[PDB]
Swiss-Prot record:
Primary component of whey, it binds retinol and is probably involved in the transport of that molecule. One of its GO terms (molecular function) is identical protein binding. Belongs to the calycin superfamily. Lipocalin family. InterPro entries: Blactoglobulin (IPR002447), Calycin (IPR012674), Lipocalin (IPR002345), Lipocalin_CS (IPR022272), Lipocln_cytosolic_FA-bd_dom (IPR000566). Keywords: Allergen, Disulfide bond, Milk protein, Retinol-binding, Secreted, Signal, Transport. Its main location: secreted. This is Beta-lactoglobulin. Synthesized in mammary gland and secreted in milk. Disulfide bonds join 66-160, 106-119, 106-121. Alternate disulfide bonds occur in equal amounts in all variants examined. It holds the Pfam family Lipocalin. The gene is LGB.
Amino acid sequence: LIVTQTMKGLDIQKVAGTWYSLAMAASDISLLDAQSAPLRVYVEELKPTPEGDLEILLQKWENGECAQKKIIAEKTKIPAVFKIDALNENKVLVLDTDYKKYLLFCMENSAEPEQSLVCQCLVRTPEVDDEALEKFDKALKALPMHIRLSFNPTQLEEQCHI
Ligand SMILES: [N]
Ligand SMILES: [Pt+2]
């Protein structure tokens, strides 16, 4: 069992724009282990829709190359929980954000969270934000993460983080 507390009072309209994947953590090492790992994805943009759905633009290393992927996240009755059908995941969980700097989110397959759970620390600008990383570490204290990756500014501005 993995219990998740998403942000009360999330306003998805205020997350719009460019983001950078500053850190990522996962319940299962193989989710993120190596360049090719299935949940090793680098968010480029969050585009909320007027009806409050969310388009996620990201990059993934696939056919020897750093590919662009587009995920349509459908809203639910909980503003911080969205339904997806991509990367073999079916939920997006928004843990926390201050809108102006950082956003913490997870993906999972609700049928098996332990085999599934990947969370990220996003920042709006390509700089290391110690505050955002401490919020990420705090948010993850109760999650059973077995791999954690933290990137430098050079990795932030790089195709698939090098
Ligand atoms: N928050
Ligand atoms: Pt908040």
